[PDB]
Acetone carboxylase alpha subunit
Amino acid sequence: TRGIVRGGETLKEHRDRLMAATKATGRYAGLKTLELREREPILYNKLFSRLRAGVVDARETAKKIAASPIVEQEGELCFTLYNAAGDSLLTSTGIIIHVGTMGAAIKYMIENNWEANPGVHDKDIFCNNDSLIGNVHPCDIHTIVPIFWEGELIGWVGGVTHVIDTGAVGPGSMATGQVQRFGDGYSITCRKVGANDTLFRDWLHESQRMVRTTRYWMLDERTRIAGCHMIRKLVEEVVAEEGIEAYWKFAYEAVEHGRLGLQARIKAMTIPGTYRQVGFVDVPYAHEDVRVPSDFAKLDTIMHAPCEMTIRRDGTWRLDFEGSSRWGWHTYNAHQVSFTSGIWVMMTQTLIPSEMINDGAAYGTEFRLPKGTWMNPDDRRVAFSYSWHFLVSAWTALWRGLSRSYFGRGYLEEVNAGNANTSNWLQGGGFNQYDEIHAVNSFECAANGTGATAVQDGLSHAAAIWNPEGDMGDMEIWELAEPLVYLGRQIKASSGGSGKYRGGCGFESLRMVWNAKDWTMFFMGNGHISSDWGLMGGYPAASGYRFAAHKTNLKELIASGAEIPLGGDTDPENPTWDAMLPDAQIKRDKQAITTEEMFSDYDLYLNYMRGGPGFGDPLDREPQAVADDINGGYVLERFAGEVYGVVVRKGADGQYGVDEAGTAAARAQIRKDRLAKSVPVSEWMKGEREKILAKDAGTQVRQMFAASFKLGPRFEKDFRTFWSLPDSWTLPEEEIGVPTYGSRYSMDISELPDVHTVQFVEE
Amino acid sequence: TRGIVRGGETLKEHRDRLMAATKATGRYAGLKTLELREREPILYNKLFSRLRAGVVDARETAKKIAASPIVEQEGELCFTLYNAAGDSLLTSTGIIIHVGTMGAAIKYMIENNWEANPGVHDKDIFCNNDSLIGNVHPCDIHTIVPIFWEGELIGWVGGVTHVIDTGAVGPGSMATGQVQRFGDGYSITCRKVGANDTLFRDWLHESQRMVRTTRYWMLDERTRIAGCHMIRKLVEEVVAEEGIEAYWKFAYEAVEHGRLGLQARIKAMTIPGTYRQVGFVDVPYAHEDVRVPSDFAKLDTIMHAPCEMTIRRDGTWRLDFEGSSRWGWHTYNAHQVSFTSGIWVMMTQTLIPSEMINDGAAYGTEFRLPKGTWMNPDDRRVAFSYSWHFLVSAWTALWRGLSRSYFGRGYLEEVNAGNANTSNWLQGGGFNQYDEIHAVNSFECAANGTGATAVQDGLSHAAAIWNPEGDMGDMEIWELAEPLVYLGRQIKASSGGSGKYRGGCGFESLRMVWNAKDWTMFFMGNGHISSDWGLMGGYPAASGYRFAAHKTNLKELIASGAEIPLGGDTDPENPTWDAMLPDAQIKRDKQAITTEEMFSDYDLYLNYMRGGPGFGDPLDREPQAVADDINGGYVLERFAGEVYGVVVRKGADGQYGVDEAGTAAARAQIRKDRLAKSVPVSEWMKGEREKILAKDAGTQVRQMFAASFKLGPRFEKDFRTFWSLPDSWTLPEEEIGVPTYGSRYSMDISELPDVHTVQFVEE
Ligand SMILES: [Mn+2]
Ligand SMILES: [Mn+2]
């Protein structure tokens, strides 16, 4: 029975052959030479130039079909072209993390003999979003079309859209509320959803009633299908015009070219050696306003992600996450594919922007993700809807590590202290201004600030780790899809991390609920803990907080001519809105994660997008920059002196200027205070060691270590050595008093029948 | 192109033709005469006898394929045979409410042009459980196979199994936790799940990872498929032996025969006139241990289900539920198909046992269910997982109403005061004794007690409204599938409703958690309110309560030989176990509905199945019966005197005997006390009327009326008339202080694209 691949081999035989060559030889598919590229270089780039333009243009055109602004204006969609074995050749920009996620679904089909059943046929249509096979979160939905030529498969197209909602318990796309997979939303596992280019009615009727924002989902489906088919047609025209021979060579030489590309850029931009760095984020599920149904999920915890980054003389490199913490009862878990494609999107943004963007760099990187950590769970009950919470707090560390190598070597233009927490996600549900069931999810946190450089300040309100082409979207467009009105949009002062170069500031949006019925809202970002750290000096960006006002009496206040709250929440420590709202129930605290809360018309919700970390000692910053930050609204005048040692005087014009003698003398005095207030690290260490031996820390600090030691013995060994702790000191998780469900017992997806999962990671 | 039905017409043309004949003519399909039955009655019964044997025997055989005891021992499975238009011809016994649910699924396909897409092809396999189309709850999963003959559809087979769990937020089948459809478990809308008699791999992988109890679910599929295919093969053999002409006549004359049967039985057993009755149950979501994520769902409420039953001189009859309450944010909502097939299952149990069991009676009954009530919701966010809560408390009223017509006419053998609340459902989830993810759901409440008769006492621990073939299942078999050990099984004293004839007692099961890991449990029945009422006298059965013991210290108690709790909780007002467990956290209260709660090995959970209501004035009971009840454990000795006026004396043997002279005087004395403590109803009425005018009642009493008034103007008009209330007195729901989400705004499933829903009810 002939296999369907161009060879006559099956999908499985074909890929198994290619991975064997790759393993044995060290080069993708065994390609020790690139025949087309070396011998017919003109033909090689013409294919590259024409096909990469095709997918770029497909994404840009098709996104005019969607109703949701996330797809139509922000561009949270991607199109990828794959070879037979599910390796990408080329991609449009956008949410390119799904280069790898959709590649792994293609491989899951390959490895579980979809070929025999349900069959991969021409004109078929597959839809998938299953996180257990490596997708980021259910709200990101794939369409996958096989491409055939003269009767045989020659590759695949994938299209991803980020969809408003998938019917989880939480109303929104990064939803809280649910604590397991069951309730985490509509989960599609590589389903055959069409044949002969036409969708199945039983998929249409079932799928559309599993969600709130049906019209939005329906159109997000057509944006995918139209893109896939523009790309399928593109390929056929390219093959018919240049030949299957060349196309077939290109479909694999391109992928080894991407591996060759990563190696060469490492060797030219980096330094061999070892780099160590760590990242944390908070999960405050103890609080009253995280109302979750399962009692075993109400505890505070901290995500712990240490990375040992090894860079070798031959230009390979290794990322070891030994020491990391366990998955939990929340929606912040991830998958080994999620995680590693995340690290790949980062190398598309600094290491290989000017090389082939495809799975080549993936084959040139080594990943060790211990089984059972949050980044590699071993449990099929796990939940995913806001994977970015953990994911974006782990990858930010690696910017710093990678930036020390550019800095030592002299490529200071490339240093970057890391990504912002891509957060607060305005979410809610109910009846909207068209009186339809609806959900919300602002992609304003596509435009957080970004890490400072060794050369200049980070960009404000500019980007996210998962899409560098930032877009905040127009106020006038968002108000077509949410039942809220804007009372402010404002640069978020003192959100940027301080330094010689200041991190990018976030921004803020103040909303009034308007024309909503039976409406709820919630918040979802980091509160207690800043994920990014500064670099070579350099402080973390600000962390998160919440602001909601209920019963504002704002109908009367608007109408009677009284003061009403406008703009941003400029100094949350000295607020101005609260005085204006004497009757309101104001929620102003650090609890940056909540579940659904009744809101009504004229209630208030502050949307806050985070800043980025800074670079260098702050009192090396040029004083004039500090003064300009004060006028430009970037830094509150209070910290000009307290952080930068800059003394500013207001001119007749009302703007701030530099007092130079004052600024020098204040900097001189800060240096003596630093000497006087610090102590030798020897001294501090024996103090902290006493606290450790006494087990003096909150339950969430003690749980992070207990769980981390159990998954990563080399990390426990290192902690014990560092603090010089007796073997009599032990930290069993079960002694901390907090629930410990899922700490010993777990069941993996691979323990279910007929499941063959693909491994991409050392594990 | 040509339709698929044996005629050459499409499914839709075929049914549309037949429903028009039925509307114009008053007889199913226009059959004013029954050709086969009148002309070849021998051939007519031979087809009937062989086919009903086939479905009975198919259900019986295939249930030996299941691992879950729900299907294998208790038989909560059903097989039904349908004509082309989706009308049942015959059924096996068991959970026959799905006669109507699978018929409504077949008809939904007919109306939405499944024929065009995805196509109804021979050898195909459909799977469905969608409650918006009229299924009881997600856990009841249908398999639907078309039957073809010489290339044309001649009917369908449906198979139903109750599945342990479908991946709702709650672990169990009657799950709490979720408050909307989103989270209420895996919802399949008439999916084509196989072709050429083989299941699709993408359905297999996806479906098995959306639930906990996977191996159980897998085998429940094979039990369904096998029964369908035994029945498809059966028909073909019957047709090949007797001819398509005869079978095609039978497939429709059978259904008008059933309508004729309902009419003849009404006219023979009943009295024409009007019957009025009502039913209630509790929903105290206000309590701390109902932890739901949505703040708009935390309130107490009461289901209000009034029925005006009209029986006519021509033998038709009408059931109007005007006045009923609204659907809510819980899992107790229903659907018009759910509700009406319930009343049909009830009429199979008294009215037509000896007639054709098929849709004939459905065509002979009139139903009016106001749109927007809990029984006919107009909102597609609604949740269903424990529909029986409302459903079984509504139908019990109709037994009483129907019983007054037997009692007046003299068929006292047929009187029954109503069904028990079929409840408490022991449920929970975690890791079981085989160290696999698992969920539990005891079907011990298939064997509640039943209503007393005009002739004799109700049966104890015997049946449920949805399956009169009660089975409590073996202890030894239940312990193969739950990580619990039985410490007692006991008739539940004083659970039966008191009367001249006592209602049936429930029973109770005391469990110890054993060999469980990361384990939770919860409760799900009625607490505050008894659904059934007694009759012509007659008190309701006991209502519900909860008992759990945590930290029992029972390992130590067992090992040391101290007292351990065994058996049942004989007198909850004077317990013996609580003293035995001095270290325990004991939960003993009325809160019969909880969400998930951590349990551990040696903790205790009491499973309580309810009793049935009684008949007649209790102090007409033969005193000897009261004495036997006391010894037999049915009634606690305290109430012999207080309820029955029976004075019982303990003998030399230790058993109770009747004090005859004492019992006469006590009965003489009770009658004088009854006079002395009652008042003229006029007197009592003006007191209660002041309370109404003063709005003196719990928020749950005031919300039940507010919601009912808005949905049922004739009920408000009638309330106001009865209590003589000014037009100045008004009860707006929004003044009661509790959330009112979904009270004005709603969006029906019929408002989504391409949705054509079928109407079976006056509405
Ligand atoms: Mn997304
Ligand atoms: Mn069921």
Q: What stands out?
A: The longest strand of chain A covers residues 273-284. Chain A touches chain B through 70 residues (CB under 8 Å). Residues B 136-137, 139-140, 162 surround manganese (II) ion (ligand 2) (CB under 6 Å). The longest helix of chain A spans residues 214-242.
